[PDB]
Amino acid sequence: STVPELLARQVTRAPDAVAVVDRDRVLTYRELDELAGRLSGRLIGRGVRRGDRVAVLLDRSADLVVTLLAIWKAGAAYVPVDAGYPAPRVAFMVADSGASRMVCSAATRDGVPEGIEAIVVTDAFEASAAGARPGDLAYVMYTSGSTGIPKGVAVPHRSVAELAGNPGWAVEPGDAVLMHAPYAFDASLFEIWVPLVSGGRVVIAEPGPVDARRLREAISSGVTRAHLTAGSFRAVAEESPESFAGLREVLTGGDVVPAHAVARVRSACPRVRIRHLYGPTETTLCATWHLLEPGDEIGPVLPIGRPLPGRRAQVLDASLRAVAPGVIGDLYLSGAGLADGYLRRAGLTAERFVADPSAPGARMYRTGDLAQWTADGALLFAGRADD
Amino acid sequence: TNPFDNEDGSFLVLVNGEGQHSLWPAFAEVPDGWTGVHGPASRQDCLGYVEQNWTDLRPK
Numbered sequence: 001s002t003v004p005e006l007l008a009r010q011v012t013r014a015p016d017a018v019a020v021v022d023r024d025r026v027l028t029y030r031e032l033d034e035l036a037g038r039l040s041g042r043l044i045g046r047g048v049r050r051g052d053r054v055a056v057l058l059d060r061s062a063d064l065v066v067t068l069l070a071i072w073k074a075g076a077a078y079v080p081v082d083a084g085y086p087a088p089r090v091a092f093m094v095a096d097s098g099a100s101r102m103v104c105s106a107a108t109r110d111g112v113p114e115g116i117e118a119i120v121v122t123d124a125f126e127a128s129a130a131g132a133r134p135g136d137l138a139y140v141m142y143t144s145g146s147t148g149i150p151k152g153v154a155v156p157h158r159s160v161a162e163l164a165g166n167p168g169w170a171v172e173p174g175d176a177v178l179m180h181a182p183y184a185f186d187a188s189l190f191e192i193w194v195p196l197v198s199g200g201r202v203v204i205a206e207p208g209p210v211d212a213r214r215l216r217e218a219i220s221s222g223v224t225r226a227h228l229t230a231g232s233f234r235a236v237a238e239e240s241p242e243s244f245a246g247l248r249e250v251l252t253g254g255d256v257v258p259a260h261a262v263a264r265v266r267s268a269c270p271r272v273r274i275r276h277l278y279g280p281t282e283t284t285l286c287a288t289w290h291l292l293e294p295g296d297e298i299g300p301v302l303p304i305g306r307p308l309p310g311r312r313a314q315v316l317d318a319s320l321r322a323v324a325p326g327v328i329g330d331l332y333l334s335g336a337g338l339a340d341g342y343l344r345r346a347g348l349t350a351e352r353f354v355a356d357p358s359a360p361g362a363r364m365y366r367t368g369d370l371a372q373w374t375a376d377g378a379l380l381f382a383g384r385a386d387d
Numbered sequence: 388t389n390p391f392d393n394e395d396g397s398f399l400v401l402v403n404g405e406g407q408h409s410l411w412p413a414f415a416e417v418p419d420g421w422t423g424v425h426g427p428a429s430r431q432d433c434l435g436y437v438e439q440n441w442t443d444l445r446p447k
């Protein structure tokens with residue numbers, strides 16, 4: 001599948017439902033689809049072709065969502081660039097990814113590197129779409145991991161759709177998801193694409209960091225689900241855990257989350273679902289998760305949890321044999337959601353996206369983390385192998 | 388040390404039906420659906436083979 005294919009089902013089912021809320025600008029599903037179609041026509045008219053990488057340099061906004069969908073409709077892959085990155089980093093991402101064109105705004109126009117065609121989103125063209133395809137690239141997101149050297153993770157449409165359409169997210173048409181993560185990071189796949197393939201709405205956060213006060217205001221305005229980075233979640237959990245009250249679900253991941261932070265939230269907010277996410281950019285946002293249902297208490301340890309539906313995990317020793325529960329070993333992730341690899345770096349790809357001994361012809365991603373199983377098939381984190 | 392990072396190890400290059408390449412420690416049974424196409428050879432030698440011969444990451 002593709003996220004555009006899943007979105008199209010929702011445009012057909014409820015075209016006049018709200019899709020994007022950006023300050024006073026509100027886009028319905030049909031309006032979002034038509035706007036993206038017009039910009040797709042503009043991109044095709046400027047020469048964008050299937051498989052091209054198109055860089056994006058925009059502040060979070062409805063125009064950002066329109067742009068990503070338009071790039072996809074043109075058959076291309078987006079290369080998300082944070083407008084606050086230094087110019088050498090922007091130049092590297094554009095050149096390394098092979099992007100010759102960059103969508104920008106008046107405000108970000110000066111950040112387009114020399115020699116790159118600027119397409120100003122704020123500037124009439126006829127609607128046209130090449131159509132997204134599951135084997136084509138959807139985006140190239142850059143990660144430096146724990147190395148410090150950034151590499152572009154090339155993720156195909158099929159993997160983005162496997163993530164966004166996963167039945168476990170439990171996002172419904174009445175949900176409103178707060179959007180504030182950088183679209184250069186893949187938490188944005190939950191904040192943007194999960195609600196849109198589900199019939200819900202994306203609520204663009206006001207500029208600046210989302211703190212406890214702004215979270216409370218967003219919830220009062222109708223937000224029902226929100227993801228916080230591990231650092232931000234730990235802070236709010238310890239300082240103001242009652243600020244999560246009224247959310248259907250709060251999500252967090254990225255770095256270590258101590259069980260004590262989750263316990264603080266559950267104590268203040270008995271009815272909030274709390275979901276812990278784990279996974280690298282190389283396997284599309286998250287590969288495992290742990291959900292604390294309302295009323296349940298977290299133990300002394302917060303698992304990274306169980307593989308998402310459609311995914312698998314293995315804990316192997318140095319001989320590549322599976323270990324028994326309670327034994328720490330190397331964690332490998334498989335099933336749905338794998339990236340194609342690292343753009344322009346086949347050798348690096350072949351040493352990290354390796355053959356899966358448990359699934360014929362398939363690959364598994366070598367996380368570089370250590371983990372152990374619980375007796376009933378959840379995973380506990382045991383630190384980075386190199387830390 | 389993870390066996391895929393062992394610079395003193397002996398390695399194969401494997402290819403699946405989609406043309407995707409994998410390094411593989413020569414001591415381990417080759418997974419079903421994968422064919423050895425290079426090695427046993429050094430880790431660095433196998434990386435060179437992959438870079439030379441795997442030119443499009445897209446699955447065939």
Ligand SMILES: N[C@@H](C(=O)O)c1ccc(O)cc1
Pocket residue numbers: 185186187251252253254277278279280281284285286
């Ligand atoms: N994909 C990782 C990351 O980019 O660090 C991630 C994992 C869990 C989460 O909640 C957010 C991001």
Ligand SMILES: N[C@@H](C(=O)O)c1ccc(O)cc1
Pocket residue numbers: 254255256257278279304369381383384
């Ligand atoms: N994979 C590392 C990391 O990206 O820093 C990681 C380790 C533990 C955890 O709970 C989340 C991520």
